[PDB]
Design a binder for this molecule. Structure first.
Ligand SMILES: [Zn+2]
Ligand SMILES: [Zn+2]
Length: 1287
């Protein structure tokens, strides 16, 4: 096990466990340091790290060492013996906490046993040289004051206290002659600067730290995890695997980009979590290859080591045995050491992926930051880690015996306040960027606030290189993952070979490279007249010396006047917030303005289903003005058009290399080595696919998802500022009253803050769900497709490459040259689907991905919508749309295809979508209005089939065509095999629900069937087992093509395509979402208009129509006349009959031109009688359930109701509408609904029943029934003359 020693600072120097050490960076000179051996091979020196630093650097200055850290300075730390001892006692306690769990102890055991190899690159293979600064360190044995006697010792780790910046912990390695033994397999003495007291702070971005903003928020770090984080670097250094490779360097070309040091992969592996994914699979293998090569050298030396010049007392065997166990080398019965790939692999993965900060945090139930790239905060000071009441060895701060175990409560700042203290900002130093405008107003922005955008250089181009395929060549996949359980349960992970004695010859060669550090300006002034996120956030703040502010929607006034604060919330909200009231009305105003704030913030849950967007945060652009000038115009519209790309502050330039070529080695007269070279090139191809996706993901995570992170944090801020301004105003107005008045004002500020911070939290969750959605969308639509392209390009090349190979060897393949001929076409056919869970295992990211893929709307690969007199694809896949001069377009998203040759639309689809899933899986939905047949052209109508939408590529694909009253869906697989399904509507109906009327079509295709849906209802099905591969992404031509009549035309709307099969459920919903409108519709399905002539139709009496009775002011109901000719193919009732009505507006007298009729509108229902315009009226004084309507010239009578309110009681789609008579707008007295009633007439001559145009109260209760009864006599539809219907 691991034994932790005990001692006090003042304990006597015994030259064994309490020595006088000569530190590695002292160069064999200077004074010694009282060092204590906390454990074998590990020393603690409770003194400030001063190597490379100037004495004055320890004081806070106008400079800083690291640009990405809030640096704390305090030169008095450890300046007394008691302070040094408290340090020792804390270190001892932290180590005990560490070994308190199997994982932590094994980490300690690996470190104690991971003794540096004796010597480095310089040392001859045959030797062991201990006289080098990275292997040996001296201790002064002799009496005080005289360095007369020295003793050498072996060591693995020396831990010092902090250097200038206390919260800047660092593991340092020993370089000698520009080389590091710790980076070449040898290993070497590792050093560290560490501070247990002043720990870092962080807060889960996509979450609320104690659901508080007006409260302290975020969590503070557990010093034991901080220590283990450094201990992991030590582990790496001790095993000589701390190699350097291609680093993640940040782009710094723009003022909004975050400046920082290059980040090595070793760092990201140490942190763990998702960061490893930022290291492409290419560089993962590189690093692996370097380390393995490093171990080959060591394993070779162990076979050649014969002596140790530096120390004749060294026992060569004991050391060969130790090293053999360290590097897990294997040994035969002779003593020949060699590398076992298995054992090496497991050791490598253990060290780079098992021991990570994330795994360790999860294991010790300690909470930590969610990513390497996450805004750093001011550190806090831990009161007393030595008091078992605040921090214990077993649980740290999360002591269950204080209900501090659950949810990491012990580390929650807003909860465990008696455990820490904030720090004097006067001792903190932060690198700032001073953004100045050419004038000059300037603002300070902490480098941590800017966007971290990885530079293109950060990524490897190893994909663009050629690869020799041989019967050997195999797949190379490195798992940036490890099973922490096995590691914890590993029997032979922890060596059981005795550790060599640490005493040895003194060091005489003190040669070593000592780093020199120095502060750099903490402020960098830049010039820009831009007003982006930083400026917009700034305009929402106000000075401490100011207490009277007012809100404004004017960003420019907010920046100018100190007493003005910018607000991205509504105009009404802003007025109410600036409103001053009487003390007696203050409470009420507080309730109101607060409630309003919540409403405004909650607009973050806005839906936009009609534009196929389930969630949109409308105020994001006004709040931050991030990306492409998002504060201007309507954000929602802008988002509908360009999507997530508009929110990005910068569009990266991706690295998507042309996959290098393949070199297949031929084996003449050889059936195996040849077939192998084939299979291996096939599987290698798959590795190129997986690897290319890794490169994409790594780039997404460090150039795109980081920007969206900043946006999320910007919104958290924006919202908080608003809450702070309203807070400031409420306090101000309240304090303007006298104490007497205040006593009678009932107000509770904790409450106000609660309601406010609550609304903030609801919006934060919306905003996060929204932004993550945008991030995943950008990955899938703007990145993955660009990779797929190249990967496909690669495939083809490799295709002819393998075919040309299976050919040159045709002979040696004999009766199979044709078998593995297809075996190649059948493999290079199905492409590898992108799956994020492969390139990472971060729970948060996987969830983002799964959520994205569960939302059907993301399966839209084409969505033609109108925008500025044109049609464009808004699916976000970039389809190029060509609309020619013959296509008629309007803002109701309707387009007309005529018989003219120039009436066509050309759509070039995106070839880079996993469309060809191999069995045809996709859907097409759209609305269409097909004109009525010309009665004299009935023969050709039922005979000529004409294509309307054609999508072919290599004689394969789909097509939509029309033959009279039938719409047909046709598929043609690669084998030319044709299949169809169709929907035909009846053309002998008195009243058709389809002829010349807008209706919704949806066609779904899966492996088995082809289904046609009409208005959500399934109408037709076709078994399509046969039909093989169908090339569905060819060019799409929208044009009438066939033997048509010059007058033939077709109107279309909302054409879109999904690369999946829509369910009846999805389709029903789409129908309802696209049927929705605030206005009513006419018979054909178009918007209802004012001042437009219409004949009336009654859904309850289809074959009836209204005629003004000759003798009386009543409207009689007569039977519609029918189709007169003799065709056996057609029958219908006349629609252009009865009175010609016209709907007139009631309110605002803005003449009688034309406009749209909306639900709940008040209107006059008039009609034309000869040269006059008459009106529909209701005699005010009837007492029966119903009565006949009064029709007469326009006039104002005291005895008649002349005002109607157009209604819509049906919740489901319908072109029917109802007409209500009320006592008057404001009233709630419902006179009745217009309909048709049957009366009995018995005169001196005639005796019969007759229906009249009436009004009935009876309808009032029928319209409430569910399902809505469409057959009620109160349902009407307006039929205007339409070129699409002639009779
Ligand atoms: Zn680190
Ligand atoms: Zn960062």
């Amino acid at each position: 096990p691991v034994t932790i020693n005990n001692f006090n600072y003042n304990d006597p120097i015994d030259n064994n466990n309490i020595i006088m050490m000569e530190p590695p960076f002292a160069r064999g000179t200077g004074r010694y340091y009282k060092a204590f051996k906390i454990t074998d091979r590990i020393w603690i020196i409770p003194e400030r790290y001063t190597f490379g630093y100037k004495p004055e650097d320890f004081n806070k200055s106008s400079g800083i060492f690291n640009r990405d850290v809030c640096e704390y300075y305090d030169p008095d730390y450890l300046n007394t013996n008691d302070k040094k001892n408290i340090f020792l006692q804390t270190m001892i306690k932290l180590f005990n906490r560490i070994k308190s769990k199997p994982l932590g102890e094994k980490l300690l055991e690996m470190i104690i046993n991971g003794i540096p190899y004796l010597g480095d690159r310089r040392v001859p293979l045959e030797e062991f040289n201990t006289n080098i600064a990275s292997v040996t360190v001296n201790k002064l044995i002799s009496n005080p004051g005289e360095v007369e006697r020295k003793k050498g010792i072996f060591a693995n780790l020396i831990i010092f206290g902090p250097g200038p910046v206390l919260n800047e912990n660092e593991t340092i390695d020993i370089g000698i002659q520009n080389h590091f033994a710790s980076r070449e397999g040898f290993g070497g003495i590792m050093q560290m600067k560490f501070c247990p007291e002043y720990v870092s702070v962080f807060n889960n971005v996509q979450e609320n730290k104690g659901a508080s903003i007006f409260n302290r928020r975020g969590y503070f770090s557990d010093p034991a995890l901080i220590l283990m984080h450094e201990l992991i670097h030590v582990l790496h250094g001790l095993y000589g695997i701390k190699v350097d490779d291609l680093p993640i360097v940040p782009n710094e070309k723009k003022f909004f980009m975050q400046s920082t040091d290059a980040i090595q992969a070793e760092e990201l592996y140490t942190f763990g979590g998702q960061d490893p994914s930022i290291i492409t699979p290419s560089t993962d293998k590189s690093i692996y290859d370097k380390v393995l090569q490093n171990f080959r050298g060591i394993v070779d030396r162990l076979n050649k080591v014969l002596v140790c010049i530096s120390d004749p007392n060294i026992n060569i065997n004991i050391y060969k045995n130790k090293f053999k166990d360290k590097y897990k080398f294997v040994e035969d019965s002779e003593g020949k050491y060699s590398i076992d790939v298995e054992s090496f692999d497991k050791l490598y993965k253990s060290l780079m992926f098992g021991f990570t900060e994330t795994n360790i945090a999860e294991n010790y139930k300690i909470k930590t930051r969610a990513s390497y790239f996450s805004d750093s905060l001011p550190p806090v000071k831990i009161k007393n880690l030595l008091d078992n009441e605040i921090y214990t060895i077993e649980e740290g701060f999360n002591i269950s015996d204080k209900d501090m175990e659950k949810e990491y409560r012990g580390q929650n700042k807003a909860i465990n306040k008696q455990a820490y203290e904030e720090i004097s900002k006067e001792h903190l130093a932060v690198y700032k960027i001073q953004m100045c405008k050419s004038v000059g107003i300037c603002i300070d922005v902490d480098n941590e606030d800017l966007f971290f955008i990885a530079d293109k250089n950060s990524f490897s181009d190893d994909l663009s290189k050629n690869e020799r395929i041989e019967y050997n060549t195999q797949s190379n996949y490195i798992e940036n993952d490890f099973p922490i359980n096995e590691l914890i349960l590993d029997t032979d992970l922890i060596s059981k070979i005795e550790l060599p004695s640490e005493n040895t010859e003194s060091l005489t060669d003190f040669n070593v490279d000592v780093p020199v550090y120095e502060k750099q300006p903490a402020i960098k002034k830049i010039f820009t007249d831009e007003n982006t996120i930083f400026q917009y956030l700034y305009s929402q703040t106000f000075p401490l010396d100011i207490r009277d502010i007012s809100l404004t929607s004017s960003f420019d006034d907010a920046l100018l006047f100190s007493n003005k604060v910018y607000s991205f919330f509504s105009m009404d909200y802003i007025k109410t917030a600036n409103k001053v009231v009487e003390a007696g009305l203050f409470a009420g105003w507080v309730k109101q303005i607060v409630n309003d704030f919540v409403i405004e913030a909650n607009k973050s849950n806005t839906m936009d289903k009609i534009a196929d967007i389930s969630l949109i945060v409308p105020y994001i652009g006004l709040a931050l003005n991030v990306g492409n000038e998002t504060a201007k115009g309507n954000f929602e519209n802008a988002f509908e058009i360009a999507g997530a790309s508009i929110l990005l502050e910068f569009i990266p330039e991706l690295l998507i290399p042309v996959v290098g070529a393949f070199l297949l080695e031929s084996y003449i007269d050889n059936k195996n080595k040849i077939i192998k070279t084939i299979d291996n090139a096939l599987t290698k191809r798959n590795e190129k696919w997986s690897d290319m996706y890794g490169l994409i993901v790594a780039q997404w995570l460090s150039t795109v998802n980081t920007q969206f992170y900043t946006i999320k944090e910007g919104m958290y801020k924006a919202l908080n500022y608003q809450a702070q301004a309203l807070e400031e105003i409420i306090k101000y107005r309240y304090n303007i009253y006298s104490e007497k008045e205040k006593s009678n004002i009932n107000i509770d500020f904790n409450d106000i803050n609660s309601k406010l911070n609550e609304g903030i939290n609801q919006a934060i969750d919306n905003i996060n769900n929204f932004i993550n959605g945008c991030s995943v969308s950008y990955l899938m639509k703007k990145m993955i497709p660009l990779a797929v392209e190249k990967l496909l390009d690669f495939d083809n090349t490799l295709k002819k490459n393998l075919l040309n190979y299976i050919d040159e060897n045709k002979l040696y393949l004999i009766g199979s040259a044709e078998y593995e001929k297809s075996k190649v076409n059948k493999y290079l056919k199905t492409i590898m689907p992108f799956d994020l869970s492969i390139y990472t295992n971060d729970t948060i990211l996987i969830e983002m991905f799964n959520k994205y893929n569960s939302e059907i709307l993301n399966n839209i690969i084409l969505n033609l919508r109108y925008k500025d007199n044109n049609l464009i694809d808004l699916s976000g896949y970039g389809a190029k749309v060509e609309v020619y001069d013959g296509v008629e377009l309007n803002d109701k998203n309707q387009f007309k295809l005529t018989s003219s040759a120039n009436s066509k639309i050309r759509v070039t689809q995106n070839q880079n979508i996993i469309f060809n899933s191999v069995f045809l899986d996709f859907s097409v939905s759209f609305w269409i209005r097909i004109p009525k047949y010309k009665n004299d052209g009935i023969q050709n109508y039922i005979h000529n089939e004409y294509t309307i939408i054609n999508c072919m590529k290599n004689n394969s694909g789909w097509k939509i065509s029309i033959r009279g009253n039938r719409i047909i869906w046709t598929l043609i697989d690669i084998n030319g095999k044709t299949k169809s399904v169709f929907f035909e509507y009846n053309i002998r109906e008195d009243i058709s629900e389809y002829i010349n009327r807008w209706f919704f079509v949806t066609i779904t295709n899966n492996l088995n069937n082809a289904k046609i849906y009409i208005n959500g209802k399934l109408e037709s099905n076709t078994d399509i087992k046969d039909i093989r591969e169908v090339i569905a992404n060819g060019e799409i031509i929208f044009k009438l093509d066939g033997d048509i009549d010059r007058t033939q035309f077709i109107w279309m709307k909302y054409f879109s395509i999904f690369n999946t099969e829509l369910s009846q459920s999805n389709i029903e919903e789409r129908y309802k979402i696209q049927s929705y409108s605030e206005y009513l519709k006419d018979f054909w399905g178009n918007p209802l208009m004012y001042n437009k002539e219409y004949y009336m139709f009654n859904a309850g009496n289809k074959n009836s129509y209204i005629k003004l009775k000759k003798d009386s002011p009543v409207g009689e109901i007569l039977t519609r006349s029918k189709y007169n000719q003799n065709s056996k193919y057609i029958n219908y009732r006349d629609l252009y009959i009865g009175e010609k009505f016209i709907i007139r507006r009631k309110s605002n007298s803005q003449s009688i031109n034309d406009d749209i009729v909306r639900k709940e509108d008040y209107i006059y229902l008039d009609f034309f009688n000869l040269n006059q315009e008459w009106r529909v009226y209701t005699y005010k004084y009837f007492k029966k359930e119903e009565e006949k309507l009064f029709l007469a010239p326009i006039s104002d009578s005291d005895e008649f109701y002349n005002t109607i309110q157009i209604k819509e009681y049906d919740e489901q789609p319908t072109y029917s509408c109802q007409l209500l008579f009320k006592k008057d707008e404001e009233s709630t007295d419902e006179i009745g609904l217009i309909g048709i009633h049957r009366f009995y007439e018995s005169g001196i001559v005639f005796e019969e029943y007759k229906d009249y145009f009436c009004i009935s109260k009876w309808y009032l209760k029928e319209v409430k029934r569910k399902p809505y009864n469409l057959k009620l006599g109160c349902n009407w539809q307006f039929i205007p003359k339409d070129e699409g219907w002639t009779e």
